[PDB]
Structure 1
Amino acid sequence: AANEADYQAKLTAYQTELARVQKANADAKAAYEAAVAANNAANAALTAENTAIKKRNADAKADYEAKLAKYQADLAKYQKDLADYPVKLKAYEDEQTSIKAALAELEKHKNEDGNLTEPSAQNLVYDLEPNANLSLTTDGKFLKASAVDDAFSKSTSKAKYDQKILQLDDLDITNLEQSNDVASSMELYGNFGDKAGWSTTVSNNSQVKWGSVLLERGQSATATYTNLQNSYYNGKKISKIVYKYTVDPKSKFQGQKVWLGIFTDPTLGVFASAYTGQVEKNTSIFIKNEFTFYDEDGKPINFDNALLSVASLNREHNSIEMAKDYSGKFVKISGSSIGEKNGMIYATDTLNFKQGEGGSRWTMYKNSQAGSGWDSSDAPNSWYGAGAIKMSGPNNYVTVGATSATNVMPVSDMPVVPGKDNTDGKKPNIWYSLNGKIRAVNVPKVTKEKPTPPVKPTAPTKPTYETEKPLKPAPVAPNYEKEPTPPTR
């Protein structure tokens, strides 16, 4: 009995110890699972972040190399410009000396025929741009080239047309006013393509092209000329010119429509016409011109006394071509028929059509007389019908047109040409251009631009790389307690 009681005591003790170890190991296992979960979470995040780090580093490296490529090009350009600076500076300084010496000599001839009364160098080189590109917008109507061709082949310009000549001042615009003459985009017309070899009143047999529009008073057309090759301001290349042509509401032509032919070469200007077949008394046609020149960077050029040539200002016994409402200051050419009066630039005191008529010194067209044919691009004395306007600022303007003499002054104050009636009607049309081809003699031109120290580029910022992190080692498994041994009876 004592042994049995002793045995049961040990059995109970044993079973209690067993249960203790079991619970203890259960808690241990739970703690190990918690450590395992924490370790797995840690390595999951480390693995994911490492993948992310590899990607960020790759992108960083790629962006950096992309930047070095642009920088390398910029730096090479910088070092080149830096090396060329002295050469450009000498060229500039050397031309500046020459021009100043040239102006000094001119000062002594400023009152001789053909000389600008105010000696000045032409900082604006803008004389010929045959390869310029013309883009037009308008609040009027674009005219189809086929319609322009048809108009030239009919009415008053037909005779010349049939002789392979495009006579712009004879074009009857009546045939450009039909609704079916309107185009959706600008179309070029001229003595090219199927009409290569033809002549026109603009540049004889040289090829010219123009876009056409039909405008009413107050309406305009804006021309954007690009692809310029030979124009500069103070040696700085001119890359673009934006020019707006507006029909002056004050124009007195009888019609309500105007045809504008805008040449692709900006230096050739424009032809404006309200002519419908018959001459008109007390008539006029004026076109407002607003323009801005731009540099290679597309920035507006702020002129500092740029010389604008105003030439071919014809004055017949019944007609006066003039420039007015202009920005800038008029500069007279000594000996020229052109002067300024009441805000208008024109032949103020004499006519300039035929020698001996109304005080004209020379005949505008070529004939048997010395000096005849002054009204031509290459005439030695074209200055006889020209002047200049010194302009400053990026936005300039001037209105150019033709008007009956009777609109400008009383009949009693006009020159008398025996056999000619000063009240004769005229055609309400005109061709004119505004460029830098100063007609005065021996005018020095600026061709060397003053150089500016190049801007040194900035090397790209070194890439910021991150280090990947090592995974954490798995937690060590706990050492569970061993079970107690069963007692024996």
Structure 2
Amino acid sequence: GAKYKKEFAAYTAALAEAESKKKQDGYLSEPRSQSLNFKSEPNAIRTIDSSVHQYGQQELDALVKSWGISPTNPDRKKSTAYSYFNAINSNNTYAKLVLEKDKPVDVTYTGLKNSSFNGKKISKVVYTYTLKETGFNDGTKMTMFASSDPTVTAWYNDYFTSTNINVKVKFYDEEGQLMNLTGGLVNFSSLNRGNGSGAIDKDAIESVRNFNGRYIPISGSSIKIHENNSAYADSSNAEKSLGARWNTSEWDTTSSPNNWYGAIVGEITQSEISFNMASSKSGNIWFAFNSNINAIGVPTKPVAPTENLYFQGAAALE
């Protein structure tokens, strides 16, 4: 009725502004509306199938040490790699995984409370992680950590070499039916370049690769589209001294007004979302997958009638 009419007026007006400000810093280069609400799920229930081994803290500590990634390793790269790993492995809210090359692992989240698409409740989300490559050792194993909250999502390691992990994402309704979230906008944020350890190499790169949807570049952002539908910065977005617009600490948070500077938006185009999380020389890499897009002036799509401790904990660990 009147509420929807008012929402429609405001929504179409916002699209006209987004059109007008297309090229302005922080705005979407092509105007869109947001129909996906997948923002925060601190009460999600995480489960992993028994065919997958969820490692204990000390069990994985010992395993990673057996690979040479140890605080008593004389090699500074290896001992530094351990230090980063140890910080994430010591958090009891993450499921601890050793991914094997080309062996998919599902992480299921049920009991979702706050999430929806186009007015329809999202009850379950399933992530599928598949290690594709890593520069570490024989290239067949790497550690990752799955958050209790599916919008905080994952940390992965590269032990200051490189890692490429494929991710599938599938969303389900209250009746367990697969939902097609085509048109929904997702936040590929915090894609740092030049934010590495100075001892090893400053030019660490975090990226999204092989995205099966369509990127919407944010105007003014360091994140550009590349070959194999990949998104990353071409030079440092970490240090003003190497040409970055802001230093990392001035943009790279979930609440910063400049956080668009290291972000791009993804438009979903399929029921099974697919992308690859890729890093080099970063040690620890937080990859959050959610609808909390960093672009300015994106209205919520109206539906016509017929804060978070897991985020805080991850931010502190950065």
Q: TM bucket by the smaller chain? A: 0.7 to 0.9
**What's the CA shift for 1:97?**
2.9
What's the CA shift string for 1:124-166, capped at 9, x where partnerless?
A: 1111111111011275532024535778999449xxxxxxxxx
1:232 positional shift: 1.4
C-alpha distance in 2 between matches for 1:261 and 1:326: 21
Aligned equivalents of 2:166, 2:273: Cα separation in 1: 11
RMSD of equivalent CA atoms: 2.8
Q: Report if the CA contact (8 A) 2:134-2:158 is conserved.
A: no
Counterpart pick for 2:277 among 395, 400, 403: 400
When normalised by structure 1's length, the TM-score is 0.54
Distance 2:35 2:108 in 1: 22
Is this contact kept in 1: 2:71–2:82, CA < 8 A? no
Which residue of structure 2 aligns with residue 112 of structure 1? 24
Q: In 1, are the aligned partners of 2:130 and 2:166 still within 8 Å (CA)?
A: yes
Q: 1:267 to 1:451 in 2, by over 3 A?
A: same
TM alignment of 1:283-298, pairs within 5 A: 283-298=161-176
- The structure with the greater share of residues assigned to strand is 2
SS at match of 2:113: coil
Residue identity in the other structure for 1:431: W
Paired amino acid for 1:273: N
In the alignment, which residue of structure 1 is the partner of 2:217? 332
SS at match of 2:12: helix
| Residues 156 and 172, structure 1, Cα contact 8 Å, conserved in 2 | no
- Kindly name which structure, 1 or 2, has the bigger radius of gyration based on alpha carbons: 1
Q: Could you tell me which residue of structure 2 aligns to residue 444 of structure 1?
A: 299
Number of aligned residue pairs: give it: 285
By how many angstroms is 1:102 displaced?
1.1
Tell me the amino acid that sits aligned with residue 116 of structure 1.
Answer: L
Q: Where do 1:16-415 residues align within 5 Å?
A: 91-137=3-49, 140-147=52-59, 155-156=70-71, 170-171=84-85, 190=91, 209-248=93-132, 250-254=133-137, 256-275=140-159, 279=160, 283-316=161-194, 317-343=202-228, 344-348=230-234, 350-357=235-242, 359-365=243-249, 372=250, 374-403=251-280
Give 1:450 deviation, angstroms: 3.7
2: CA distance, partners of 1:399 / 1:245: 9
Amino acid in structure 2 at the alignment position of 1:106: A
Q: Distance in 2 between matches of 1:168 and 1:309?
A: 29
Instruction: Note the C-alpha offset of 1:122.
Output: 1.3
Q: Separation in 1 of the partners of 2:86 and 2:144?
A: 13
CA distance in 1, matches of 2:186, 2:297: 16
1:432 paired with 2:315, answer: no
Q: 2:313 — aligned with what?
A: none
How many Å apart are 1:339 and its aligned residue? 0.6
Q: Structure 2: how far apart are the matches of 1:149 and 1:214?
A: 12
- Once residues 292 and 150 of structure 2 are traced to their aligned partners in structure 1, the CA distance between those partners, rounded to angstroms, is 12
CA–CA separation in structure 1 for the residues paired with 2:107 and 2:247: 34
Whether the 8 Å CA contact 1:123–1:234 is kept in 2: the answer is yes
Q: Which amino acid aligns with 2:85?
A: L
3-state SS, counterpart of residue 190 of structure 2:
coil
Percent identical: 34
How far does residue 171 in structure 1 lie from its aligned partner after superposition?
1.7
- Quote how far apart the aligned CAs of 1:121 are: 1.3
